[PDB]
């Protein structure tokens, strides 16, 4: 079987586009990320999602953003999608002002926290480094 | 009744522990590929088919170039973590 897609709408697609980071963090500017956000928004919109693009979000905004998104009424939504575009390291993503564990972000949609999305697919696309290892290739 | 951790799907641009490539010109590899595959097959295939294809594209049509040997000709493979309990089609 497949997920039921007979709802008024497919759902909400939140895009977090972090390009510039505070001097402190030492993290560089992510050139090429505005092209990504443009492509993704254009693409998820045609699939049928209600796309919202946020830029250079602090760690506070990102948590708040997602918390309040999970508090909405998704009763008439088929699914939910969230695309993260930023710097990262093992199990964490960067805000403009610091670091946030990914688990805390996705937690807002777990069980009782969002009874409205239960049994519905929650998709997280994450474009962010997960360490500094490099795949050299083969053959 | 059901698990609180069910029905989630994480499509990571890279594997645990690795760097994730991007071009200041055309954007990151994972996103460029994710989009082209979605444009074509978005209304036909199932995300797993979609994402599996994405895995193939960034793994064969991408290799880095750098004036530094430390970062020259490197490769990348995305990572799909799934807890979905059913097939997902964006259509009817």
């Amino acid at each position: 079987y497949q997920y039921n897609m007979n709802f008024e709408k497919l759902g909400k697609c939140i895009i977090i586009n972090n390009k510039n980071f505070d001097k402190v963090t030492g993290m560089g500017v992510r050139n090429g990320t505005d092209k990504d956000a443009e492509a993704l928004f254009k693409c998820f919109r045609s699939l049928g999602f209600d796309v919202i693009v946020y830029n250079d979000c602090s760690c506070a905004k990102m948590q708040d953003l997602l918390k309040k998104a999970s508090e909405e009424d998704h009763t008439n939504a088929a699914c939910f999608a969230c695309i993260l575009l930023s710097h990262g390291e093992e199990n964490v993503i960067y805000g403009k002002d610091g670091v946030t564990p990914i688990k805390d972000l996705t937690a807002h949609f777990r069980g009782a926290r969002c009874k409205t999305l239960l049994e519905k697919p929650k998709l997280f696309f994450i474009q962010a480094c997960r360490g500094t290892e490099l795949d050299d290739g083969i053959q | 009744k059901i698990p609180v951790e069910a029905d989630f799907l994480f499509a990571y641009s890279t594997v645990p522990g690795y760097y994730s490539w991007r071009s200041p010109g055309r954007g990151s590899w994972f996103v460029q590929a994710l989009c082209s595959i979605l444009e074509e097959h978005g209304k036909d295939l199932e995300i797993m088919q979609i994402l599996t294809r994405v895995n193939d594209r960034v793994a064969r049509h991408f290799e880095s170039q750098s004036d530094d040997p430390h970062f020259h000709e490197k490769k990348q493979i995305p990572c799909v973590v799934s807890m979905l309990t059913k097939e997902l089609y964006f259509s009817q």
């Binding site: 390291e89 490099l134 | 760097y19 010109g25 590899w29 170039q65 004036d67």
Partner: peptide, 18 residues
């Protein structure tokens, strides 16, 4: 190292542009 620095700060980009 310069290699490790450029990587942790995500400054290493792909130059396949040109």
């Amino acid at each position: 190292t310069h290699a490790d620095y450029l990587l942790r700060t995500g400054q290493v980009v792909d130059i396949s542009d040109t």
